Amino acid sequence: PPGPLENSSAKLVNDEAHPWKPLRPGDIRGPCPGLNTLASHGYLPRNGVATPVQIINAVQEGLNFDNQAAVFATYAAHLVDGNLITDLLSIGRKTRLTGPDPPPPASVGGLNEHGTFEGDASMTRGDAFFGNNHDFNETLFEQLVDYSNRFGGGKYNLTVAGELRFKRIQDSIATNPNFSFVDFRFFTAYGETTFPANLFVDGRRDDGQLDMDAARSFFQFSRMPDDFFRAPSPRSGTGVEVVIQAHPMQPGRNVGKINSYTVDPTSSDFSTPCLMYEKFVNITVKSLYPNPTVQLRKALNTNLDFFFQGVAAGCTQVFPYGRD
Amino acid sequence: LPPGPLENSSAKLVNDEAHPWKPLRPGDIRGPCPGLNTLASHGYLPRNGVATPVQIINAVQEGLNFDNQAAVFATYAAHLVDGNLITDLLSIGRKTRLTGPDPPPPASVGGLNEHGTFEGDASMTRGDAFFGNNHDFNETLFEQLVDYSNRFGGGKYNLTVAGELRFKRIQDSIATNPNFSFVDFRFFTAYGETTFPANLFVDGRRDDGQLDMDAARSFFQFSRMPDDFFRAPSPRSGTGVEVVIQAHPMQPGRNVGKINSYTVDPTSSDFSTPCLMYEKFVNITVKSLYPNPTVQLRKALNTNLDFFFQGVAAGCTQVFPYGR
Ligand SMILES: *[C@@H]1O[C@H](CO)[C@@H](O[C@@H]2O[C@H](CO)[C@@H](O[C@@H]3O[C@H](CO[C@H]4O[C@H](CO[C@H]5O[C@H](CO)[C@@H](O)[C@H](O)[C@@H]5O[C@H]5O[C@H](CO)[C@@H](O)[C@H](O)[C@@H]5O)[C@@H](O)[C@H](O[C@H]5O[C@H](CO)[C@@H](O)[C@H](O)[C@@H]5O)[C@@H]4O)[C@@H](O)[C@H](O[C@H]4O[C@H](CO)[C@@H](O)[C@H](O)[C@@H]4O)[C@@H]3O)[C@H](O)[C@H]2NC(C)=O)[C@H](O)[C@H]1NC(C)=O
Ligand SMILES: *[C@@H]1O[C@H](CO)[C@@H](O[C@@H]2O[C@H](CO)[C@@H](O[C@@H]3O[C@H](CO[C@H]4O[C@H](CO)[C@@H](O)[C@H](O)[C@@H]4O)[C@@H](O)[C@H](O[C@H]4O[C@H](CO)[C@@H](O)[C@H](O)[C@@H]4O)[C@@H]3O)[C@H](O)[C@H]2NC(C)=O)[C@H](O)[C@H]1NC(C)=O
Ligand code: HEM
Ligand code: HEM
Ligand SMILES: *[C@@H]1O[C@H](CO)[C@@H](O[C@@H]2O[C@H](CO)[C@@H](O[C@@H]3O[C@H](CO)[C@@H](O)[C@H](O)[C@@H]3O)[C@H](O)[C@H]2NC(C)=O)[C@H](O)[C@H]1NC(C)=O
Ligand SMILES: *[C@@H]1O[C@H](CO)[C@@H](O[C@@H]2O[C@H](CO)[C@@H](O[C@@H]3O[C@H](CO)[C@@H](O)[C@H](O)[C@@H]3O)[C@H](O)[C@H]2NC(C)=O)[C@H](O)[C@H]1NC(C)=O
Ligand SMILES: *[C@@H]1O[C@H](CO)[C@@H](O[C@@H]2O[C@H](CO)[C@@H](O)[C@H](O)[C@H]2NC(C)=O)[C@H](O)[C@H]1NC(C)=O
Ligand SMILES: *[C@@H]1O[C@H](CO)[C@@H](O[C@@H]2O[C@H](CO)[C@@H](O)[C@H](O)[C@H]2NC(C)=O)[C@H](O)[C@H]1NC(C)=O
Ligand SMILES: *[C@@H]1O[C@H](CO)[C@@H](O[C@@H]2O[C@H](CO)[C@@H](O)[C@H](O)[C@H]2NC(C)=O)[C@H](O)[C@H]1NC(C)=O
Ligand SMILES: *[C@@H]1O[C@H](CO)[C@@H](O[C@@H]2O[C@H](CO)[C@@H](O)[C@H](O)[C@H]2NC(C)=O)[C@H](O)[C@H]1NC(C)=O
Ligand SMILES: CC(=O)N[C@@H]1[C@@H](O)[C@H](O)[C@@H](CO)O[C@H]1O
Ligand SMILES: *[C@@H]1O[C@H](CO)[C@@H](O)[C@H](O)[C@H]1NC(C)=O
Ligand SMILES: *[C@@H]1O[C@H](CO)[C@@H](O)[C@H](O)[C@H]1NC(C)=O
Ligand SMILES: *[C@@H]1O[C@H](CO)[C@@H](O)[C@H](O)[C@H]1NC(C)=O
Ligand SMILES: *[C@@H]1O[C@H](CO)[C@@H](O)[C@H](O)[C@H]1NC(C)=O
Ligand SMILES: OC[C@H]1O[C@@H](O)[C@@H](O)[C@@H](O)[C@@H]1O
Ligand SMILES: OC[C@H]1O[C@@H](O)[C@@H](O)[C@@H](O)[C@@H]1O
Ligand SMILES: [Cl-]
Ligand SMILES: [Cl-]
Ligand SMILES: [Cl-]
Ligand SMILES: [Cl-]
Ligand SMILES: [Mg+2]
Ligand SMILES: [Mg+2]
């Protein structure tokens, strides 16, 4: 697992060695505009299948994503969505490129796999319930623009993030009878809304105000603006507290029908990051791998260790298969 | 310019042969900040505790891996209100002739000890200014930190301990300090500070956010790094502050001339309005110290207000109290 950038100042990353290209048939793109754009500028394999080490070097070098967040997000995703023997992860749909599957109920389903990492009330993608959880959706993007106009002076910023995050949750509650918003997804849904203001903003300026042309380029086409400079120093979810505090929300879920959102008092929330860590490892990962062979157990323990090092709140390490 | 981010920001020995702890030698100034005190006491900063903004940022980054945005934000904020803008020198403690000849009233140039500019109420290990001394280590407060760590962190200080102690300290001040104030700048900074010991005082080889009480006392009381201390393995500052905020959500306010009269102030900024915090700091705090400044002082203010703006986490739009 790579350490932080050696030299992490702003610099042009839309450069000569990293041109955008269109998708070839077979090139895999998914629900993350950050990984998508990196793949499309060749910071990641252009076909969208990568090792964890590759994804981490790419997000730091391409966009100056900080090391702790890159390590948390990448090994969390690899544990639930990736192939632990081959050490590969698809950034979108399940693919044979990741090699021979483990036994069920592990899915190795790529970032597109619903319920594991990816989840509901995304900004520019529709819920899995309605059929397609990974393609750019134009109606939701035009909503992001609207809110930018109304709260951001035409630009996306943390204030807009706060408003739209809530709007999307409300939208899901009213329309999605499967709406779920607990645990891992509750956590990551709020930190994602800060990323575009933090990281899609040209680094020479770095003033957290994202223009709509830049926003469309990343979200829709996986493409950096012309002459794009990365952020002037490493960061990820700075300001998430702005987005949480705008519209206080307790973790919960619709119960088999629309508008039935019911708080779940067993879910972690922001005051309990280590319950969220423990349930991810001790319930989510453990249920995908309830009885691993010696070889799989050893791959699981190595990735669980690397995952534990990226956990922002620190926490106490949990061992689903033992320390041995 | 402010220094940019650290070249190679990995974990490494920082309590080394070139940076030993030394006892205070009269002349030497120590203040309310255990981070800055300890850096001065190991020679990362000047040992007498008076430094330029550039020295302080280089010191917090190289000594402790404090991240660049936070180092710039705090350093220029404190310099604007507590420092000498003409000599370019800031005391980490008391007001001193070592920062040079003063500007005109009503500027104070009072050092970091100056109550209510940067320093303020409900500190963890230091008493409120109202009771007499806002900067000395207070053994009864540290013992209550040790007690909350036994109760909530298994004997170690971590973000769960921080959430409970931060709220305890606020309740102590409401009950005992008739002047307690907890608005605007202080309301914002108080929360982030409670994360720093978990993120930054924990040996960088471990980096699991569990701070032992011997390490904690070393930094807070003696201004000394633990033996063989490694700084954190990448840059960070207020990671996990939302964990502290959401443990006991609370709005900004003040006692109203007597104990137990905490009154929410609806004109204060809070965590959802970080740009109003920025703006009030500049329009009100800074500009009432320097209501009408001469030509050279006006240049120095505008230069430092620029650097300050670049450090604002939320991004925001720049305000210009003296024009552009
Ligand atoms: C190092 O720092 C420490 C701490 O800052 C310094 O010591 C402090 O010094 C100040 C200044 O002298 C003292 O201020 C004075 O406080 C007294 C009140 O004392 C008693 O009540 C205190 C508050 O308790 C309530 O709130 C807390 C916090 O939530 C809570 O835990 C308590 O249980 C109680 O809560 C109430 O409300 C709750 C709802 O939230 C309810 O559940 C509950 O039912 C309660 O009703 C308390 O902390 C204090 O406890 C200490 O002292 C006793 C022994 O006396 C000891 O047994 C405890 O273990 C503690 O050690 C007391 O119980 C107040 O009366 C004074 O008010 C006078 O003066 C002010 C200011 O001038 C005037 O405005 C008033 O009108 C009045 O004349 C005063 O404000 C502070 O109490 C003290 N704290 C300590 C010692 O812990 C120390 O000085 C510093 N050292 C150095 C060297 O500087
Ligand atoms: C992102 O970009 C925006 C614009 O550049 C920045 O500026 C903030 O913009 C916000 C959002 O529009 C402003 O907040 C709004 O201000 C309105 C007026 O505020 C004053 O006047 C009213 C009287 O009408 C007073 O009551 C109030 O106390 C203020 O003195 C308010 O009417 C708005 O409140 C209401 O809005 C919604 C609309 O959907 C209502 O439904 C609610 O009831 C709500 O109460 C709103 O607060 C804000 O003033 C701007 N801030 C500043 C400092 O200028 C953001 O700063 C920028 N963000 C970042 C992180 O960069
Ligand atoms: C570090 C490896 C990363 C992984 C494994 C990862 C994975 C994901 C996944 C699976 C989603 C979908 C969540 C949802 O359902 O909405 C997502 C969303 C998101 N990602 Fe990433 N991501 C990573 C890095 C990045 C980077 C570097 C950026 C920005 C620089 C970023 C920006 C975002 C944003 C803005 C979304 C939300 C998009 C939306 O809601 O429309 N990600 N990420
Ligand atoms: C970068 C320049 C910095 C400045 C200008 C600065 C200034 C301050 C000031 C004025 C206070 C007192 C606030 C109060 O409690 O009343 C404070 C508190 C504190 N600082 Fe800093 N600080 C800096 C860097 C850091 C660093 C690098 C660390 C640790 C790595 C740190 C750790 C803390 C902690 C833990 C407190 C609270 C102490 C307490 O509540 O007992 N600071 N700082
Ligand atoms: C709304 O949520 C429900 C409940 O999660 C979704 O139904 C579930 O769909 C999954 C995935 O297709 C099913 O699990 C699979 O079942 C097949 C064959 O039945 C099995 O061979 C697979 O290995 C896997 O078990 C499952 O039947 C079902 N879960 C239930 C009923 O608890 C439902 O599809 C969602 N609705 C929409 C429109 O998305
Ligand atoms: C992009 O996202 C938008 C908004 O989230 C999706 O639009 C939604 O589409 C449904 C139908 O697919 C619209 O309502 C439908 O109305 C009929 C009545 O004839 C009803 O029988 C259906 O059950 C359904 O309710 C819905 O109003 C619309 N929501 C909007 C516009 O806010 C859209 O499907 C997404 N695009 C893609 C390609 O998925
Ligand atoms: C606590 O605040 C009080 C009230 O603001 C202060 O004392 C008063 O305020 C001014 C100072 O600005 C004094 O000149 C008045 O005589 C005081 N009395 C009243 C009724 O206003 C005082 O500055 C603070 N006390 C301490 C110890 O810091
Ligand atoms: C702070 O340390 C404590 C103990 O090491 C951790 O708290 C425990 O959390 C477990 C599950 O992780 C719960 O059963 C208890 O509520 C906790 N034990 C207690 C309170 O004695 C806590 O997670 C740590 N916090 C962080 C952020 O690392
Ligand atoms: C511009 O600022 C200067 C001070 O830098 C002002 O000087 C005033 O001097 C009087 C003398 O009694 C003081 O009492 C005031 O406090 C000072 N004013 C201020 C605002 O601090 C001078 O008056 C100001 N000139 C203009 C045109 O505003
Ligand atoms: C702080 O001061 C600035 C101006 O120095 C404030 O006023 C706004 O400034 C912008 C930028 O030039 C103008 O577009 C607006 O027209 C200004 N408003 C007014 C009423 O003139 C800003 O609002 C101030 N903020 C606070 C909280 O005091
Ligand atoms: C506008 C503002 O910031 N006012 C605070 C106030 O709420 C508090 O009562 C006062 C005296 O202790 O200190 C001021 O700094
Ligand atoms: C670090 O990165 C930037 C952009 O390449 C450059 O300005 C700076 O000198 C580099 N520092 C080095 C290579 O030491
Ligand atoms: C996970 O397992 C660990 C150790 O066996 C245990 O401490 C913890 O309670 C478990 N977590 C849950 C939520 O069951
Ligand atoms: C291991 O036990 C779990 C119980 O959760 C079961 O699902 C899994 O199939 C078991 N595996 C064996 C050894 O095949
Ligand atoms: C840079 O960090 C690496 C990572 O551990 C380390 O090996 C090396 O000693 C550092 N380089 C310098 C010049 O300090
Ligand atoms: O143990 C070293 C390697 O182990 C694998 O399991 C991976 O997931 C890598 O990221 C790691 O570098
Ligand atoms: O530009 C005015 C001020 O700028 C600062 O950065 C310092 O270097 C000072 O020496 C000077 O007073
Ligand atoms: Cl980093
Ligand atoms: Cl530099
Ligand atoms: Cl940094
Ligand atoms: Cl005492
Ligand atoms: Mg989604
Ligand atoms: Mg204080």
| CATH code of the domain in which A263 resides | 1.10.489.10
Q: Is the Cβ of A321 closer than 8 Å to some Cβ of chain B?
A: no
Does A66 contact B8 at a Cβ distance shorter than 8 Å? no
Lining residues, ligand 8, CB within 6 Å = A 273-274, 278, 313-316; B 152-154, 158-160, 209
Interface of A with B in 213-252 (CB under 8 A): 232-235, 238-242, 244-246, 248
Angle value at C-alpha A58, between A54 and A59, nearest 5 degrees: 120
- Write the burial class of residue B116 (CB in 10 Å: 0-12 exposed, 13-18 middle, 19+ buried): middle
Q: Using DSSP, state whether B181 is helix, strand or coil.
A: strand
Q: Which amino acid, A130?
A: F
Q: In this structure, are residues B74 and B35 in contact, taking their beta carbons and an 8 Å threshold?
A: no
Does A209 contact B315 at a Cβ distance shorter than 8 Å? yes
Q: In this structure, are residues B74 and B11 in contact, taking their beta carbons and an 8 Å threshold?
A: no
Domain count, chain B: 1
Does A241 contact B239 at a Cβ distance shorter than 8 Å? no
B181-182 β-sheet, strand order:
B181-182, B253-254, B263-264
Q: Which amino acid, A177?
A: P
Provide the β-strand partners of residue B116: none
What residue's CA is closest to ligand 14, atom 5? A290
Q: Which of B257, B37, B260, B242 is nearest to B160 (CA)?
A: B242
HSE-CB at A23 with a 13 A cutoff on CA atoms is 12
Residue B63 host element (H or E): helix B53-64
Does B33 count as an annotated binding residue? yes
The nearest alpha carbon in chain A to B200 belongs to A314
Query: Cβ contacts (< 8 Å) between A314 and chain B: which residues?
Result: 158-159, 198, 202, 207-210, 240
Provide the β-strand partners of residue B181: B254
* CB contacts < 8 A (A, B): 125
Taking the CA atoms of A240, A241, A247 and A253 in sequence, report the sign of the dihedral they define. positive
Q: Which of B277, B284, B287 is nearest to B309 (CA)?
A: B277
- Write the burial class of residue B19 (CB in 10 Å: 0-12 exposed, 13-18 middle, 19+ buried): middle
Residue A252 host element (H or E): strand A252-253
Q: Using only the alpha carbons of chain B, give its radius of gyration.
A: 19
Tokens of B283: 């329009």
Query: Cβ contacts (< 8 Å) between B202 and chain A: which residues?
Result: 314
Q: Is the Cβ of B167 closer than 8 Å to some Cβ of chain A?
A: no
Provide the β-strand partners of residue B230: B13
Query: Cβ contacts (< 8 Å) between A271 and chain B: which residues?
Result: 163, 243, 246-247
Among the partner residues A209, A270, A317, nearest to B243 by beta-carbon distance: A270
Antiparallel, parallel or unpaired: β B181-182 and B211-212: unpaired
Q: Residue B49: which region, alpha, beta or left (left: phi > 0; alpha: psi -120 to 50)?
A: left
Of B179, B254, B256, the one to substitute when testing ligand 7's pocket (max ligand atoms within 8 A of C-beta) is B179
Q: Which of A235, A228, A224, A226 is nearest to A199 (CA)?
A: A235
Respond yes or no on whether the N-terminal peptide bond of residue B274 is cis (omega within 30° of 0): no
In angstroms, the Cα distances linking B160 to A135, A251, B146, B165 are 38, 19, 13, 9
- Write the burial class of residue B324 (CB in 10 Å: 0-12 exposed, 13-18 middle, 19+ buried): exposed
Query: Cβ contacts (< 8 Å) between B5 and chain A: which residues?
Result: 8-9, 232-234
What residue's CA is closest to ligand 3, atom 43? A32
Domain hosting residue A8, numbered range: 1-324
Q: Using DSSP, state whether B236 is helix, strand or coil.
A: strand
Q: Which amino acid, A43?
A: Y
The nearest alpha carbon in chain A to B69 belongs to A233
Angle value at C-alpha B35, between B238 and B307, nearest 5 degrees: 65
Question: Which experimental method was this entry solved with?
Answer: X-ray
* E-state strands within B171-291: 181-182, 211-212, 253-254, 263-264
